[PDB]
Design an enzyme around this catalytic site. Structure first.
Site, PDB file in Angstrom:
ATOM      1  CE1 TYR A   1      -4.050  -2.130   0.284  1.00  0.00           C
ATOM      2  CE2 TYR A   1      -2.924  -2.963   2.045  1.00  0.00           C
ATOM      3  CZ  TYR A   1      -3.895  -3.144   1.074  1.00  0.00           C
ATOM      4  OH  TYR A   1      -4.826  -4.099   1.343  1.00  0.00           O
TER       5      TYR A   1
ATOM      6  CG  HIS B   1      -2.559  -1.551  -4.247  1.00  0.00           C
ATOM      7  ND1 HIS B   1      -2.532  -2.560  -2.961  1.00  0.00           N
ATOM      8  CD2 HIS B   1      -3.808  -1.734  -4.685  1.00  0.00           C
ATOM      9  CE1 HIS B   1      -3.617  -3.040  -3.009  1.00  0.00           C
ATOM     10  NE2 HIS B   1      -4.642  -2.833  -3.800  1.00  0.00           N
TER      11      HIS B   1
ATOM     12  CD  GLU C   1      -7.070  -1.344  -2.230  1.00  0.00           C
ATOM     13  OE1 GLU C   1      -7.038  -1.625  -1.161  1.00  0.00           O
ATOM     14  OE2 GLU C   1      -7.416  -2.040  -3.300  1.00  0.00           O
TER      15      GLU C   1
ATOM     16  NE  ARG D   1      -7.708  -2.024   1.972  1.00  0.00           N
ATOM     17  CZ  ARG D   1      -7.496  -2.810   3.262  1.00  0.00           C
ATOM     18  NH1 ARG D   1      -7.829  -2.246   4.341  1.00  0.00           N
ATOM     19  NH2 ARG D   1      -7.444  -4.160   3.340  1.00  0.00           N
TER      20      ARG D   1
ATOM     21  CG  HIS E   1     -12.019  -6.006   2.140  1.00  0.00           C
ATOM     22  ND1 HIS E   1     -12.461  -6.189   0.757  1.00  0.00           N
ATOM     23  CD2 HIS E   1     -10.844  -5.665   2.345  1.00  0.00           C
ATOM     24  CE1 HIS E   1     -11.168  -6.318   0.099  1.00  0.00           C
ATOM     25  NE2 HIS E   1     -10.434  -5.787   1.172  1.00  0.00           N
TER      26      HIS E   1
ATOM     27  CG  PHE F   1     -13.382  -2.831  -1.422  1.00  0.00           C
ATOM     28  CD1 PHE F   1     -12.813  -2.633  -0.109  1.00  0.00           C
ATOM     29  CD2 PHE F   1     -12.438  -3.390  -2.505  1.00  0.00           C
ATOM     30  CE1 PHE F   1     -11.742  -2.913   0.119  1.00  0.00           C
ATOM     31  CE2 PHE F   1     -10.970  -3.329  -2.352  1.00  0.00           C
ATOM     32  CZ  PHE F   1     -10.634  -2.978  -0.513  1.00  0.00           C
TER      33      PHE F   1
HETATM   34  N1  LIG Z   1     -12.187  -5.716  -4.975  1.00  0.00           N
HETATM   35  C1  LIG Z   1     -11.253  -5.259  -5.584  1.00  0.00           C
HETATM   36  N2  LIG Z   1      -9.984  -5.562  -5.294  1.00  0.00           N
HETATM   37  C2  LIG Z   1      -9.192  -4.683  -6.084  1.00  0.00           C
HETATM   38  C3  LIG Z   1      -9.376  -3.517  -6.674  1.00  0.00           C
HETATM   39  N3  LIG Z   1      -8.371  -3.110  -7.344  1.00  0.00           N
HETATM   40  C4  LIG Z   1      -7.532  -3.907  -6.699  1.00  0.00           C
HETATM   41  N4  LIG Z   1      -7.750  -5.014  -6.101  1.00  0.00           N
HETATM   42  C5  LIG Z   1      -6.920  -5.912  -5.557  1.00  0.00           C
HETATM   43  O1  LIG Z   1      -7.252  -7.111  -6.559  1.00  0.00           O
HETATM   44  C6  LIG Z   1      -7.051  -8.397  -5.515  1.00  0.00           C
HETATM   45  C7  LIG Z   1      -8.445  -8.967  -5.430  1.00  0.00           C
HETATM   46  O2  LIG Z   1      -9.620  -8.526  -5.108  1.00  0.00           O
HETATM   47  C8  LIG Z   1      -6.567  -7.915  -3.997  1.00  0.00           C
HETATM   48  O3  LIG Z   1      -5.299  -8.063  -4.104  1.00  0.00           O
HETATM   49  C9  LIG Z   1      -7.139  -6.365  -4.231  1.00  0.00           C
HETATM   50  O4  LIG Z   1      -6.162  -5.585  -3.459  1.00  0.00           O
HETATM   51  P1  LIG Z   1      -6.590  -5.428  -1.662  1.00  0.00           P
HETATM   52  O5  LIG Z   1      -7.004  -6.820  -1.183  1.00  0.00           O
HETATM   53  O6  LIG Z   1      -5.091  -4.734  -1.255  1.00  0.00           O
HETATM   54  O7  LIG Z   1      -7.489  -4.362  -1.997  1.00  0.00           O
HETATM   55  C10 LIG Z   1     -10.665  -3.231  -6.810  1.00  0.00           C
HETATM   56  O8  LIG Z   1     -11.397  -2.203  -7.487  1.00  0.00           O
HETATM   57  N5  LIG Z   1     -11.524  -4.096  -6.014  1.00  0.00           N
END
Ligand SMILES: Nc1nc2c(ncn2[C@@H]2O[C@H](CO)[C@@H](O)[C@H]2OP(=O)(O)O)c(=O)[nH]1
Ligand SMILES: [Ca+2]
Length: 104
Positions: free
Chosen positions: A38, A40, A58, A77, A92, A100
């Protein structure tokens, strides 16, 4: 009252501003923290109708009030863009799998 309610977590505008400032500075410096690196890119798979423009990033916001510095990121986030404009606060909590939902 909470400016943002993420599941059971309560955040004020100041909580979000502090977190956002931390995440944006790291983004500008090209540094990351934590196992998930993070801040990212946030791809917005959910299709949230954000009022500010992409790209989005995020960064975890913590219920402890402290700024994220590694370790477990929790479920919440803050999402900001390239101009350091707040897109929204998501979580989450209450969402299936790694999806999310917006904090109310
Ligand atoms: N649900 C969700 N996950 C995201 C998105 N963009 C990046 N991710 C990342 O994609 C993977 C599967 O969801 C996770 O590693 C998640 O990161 P984070 O878990 O750090 O949020 C998004 O728009 N939605
Ligand atoms: Ca607080």
């Amino acid at each position: 009252a909470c400016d943002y309610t993420c599941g059971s977590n309560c955040y004020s505008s100041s909580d979000v501003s502090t977190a956002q400032a931390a995440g944006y500075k790291l983004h500008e410096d090209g540094e990351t923290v934590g196992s998930n690196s993070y801040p990212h890119k946030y791809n917005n798979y959910e299709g949230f109708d954000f009022s500010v423009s992409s790209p989005y990033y995020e960064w975890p916001i913590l219920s402890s009030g402290d700024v994220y510095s590694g370790g477990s990121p929790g479920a919440d986030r803050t999402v900001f863009n390239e101009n350091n404009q707040l897109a929204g606060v998501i979580t989450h909590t209450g969402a299936s799998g790694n999806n999310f939902v917006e904090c109310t």
